[PDB]
Design a protein around this ligand. Sequence first.
Ligand SMILES: Nc1nc2c(ncn2[C@@H]2O[C@H](COP(=O)(O)OP(=O)(O)CP(=O)(O)O)[C@@H](O)[C@H]2O)c(=O)[nH]1
Ligand SMILES: [Cl-]
Ligand SMILES: [Cl-]
Ligand SMILES: [Mg+2]
Lengths: 34, 178
Amino acid sequence: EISAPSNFEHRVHTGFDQHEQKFTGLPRQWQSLI
Amino acid sequence: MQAIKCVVVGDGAVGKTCLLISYTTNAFPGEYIPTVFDNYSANVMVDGKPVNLGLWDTAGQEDYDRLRPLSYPQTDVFLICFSLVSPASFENVRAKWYPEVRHHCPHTPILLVGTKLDLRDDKDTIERLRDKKLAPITYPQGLAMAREIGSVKYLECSALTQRGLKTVFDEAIRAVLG
Ligand SMILES: Nc1nc2c(ncn2[C@@H]2O[C@H](COP(=O)(O)OP(=O)(O)CP(=O)(O)O)[C@@H](O)[C@H]2O)c(=O)[nH]1
Ligand SMILES: [Cl-]
Ligand SMILES: [Cl-]
Ligand SMILES: [Mg+2]
């Protein structure tokens, strides 16, 4: 059977800065891509 | 530990974040805040074995169209979501989401998910839909769309009431792990 989920973690929270037109809190792997 | 990458996509305002947050934390977010990108993790016990569920919460905003595909490599399953009370979001399953997903991941399984099930019978919602020459999407209509995009499963749910909610993620899991 499949249990209810547990131990939630928010690993990445990305935003966007309009002044610089740059993403903020990008996954470390995406920093060379965007 | 087994791990599953599940990526969630669909129009703005369809309920992707509420769906993920209601399943993982059992809370319905009180504010409507559009997503740029977020990654959540949660543990689930599947047939006695622990599984790490990785959840990729993507932006329905067109303005983030170039950021979105960065989530796609090595995806194990997609949830394509539309609101059962937004015909337009449903039409965009065919017009945008299925084509984009399938272009990046030509063989990854897709679950079609109809959200906001609590609103399909909301008389005021029905009336304002009718005012714009629209109606809520029905189960048969949803199922027909799912069949047309070659989805492994069509599911309806409400993040708000959690009706059908666990089932979406249980099916997503069985789609990847059997
Ligand atoms: N009645 C009802 N409303 C819902 C449900 N799920 C989400 N909503 C509402 O829909 C709106 C959008 O929810 P949200 O989860 O932010 O949508 P999203 O698809 O993540 C939007 P983006 O793609 O921009 O992040 C909000 O007003 C939210 O309260 C539901 O199951 N029932
Ligand atoms: Cl099907
Ligand atoms: Cl249901
Ligand atoms: Mg969101």
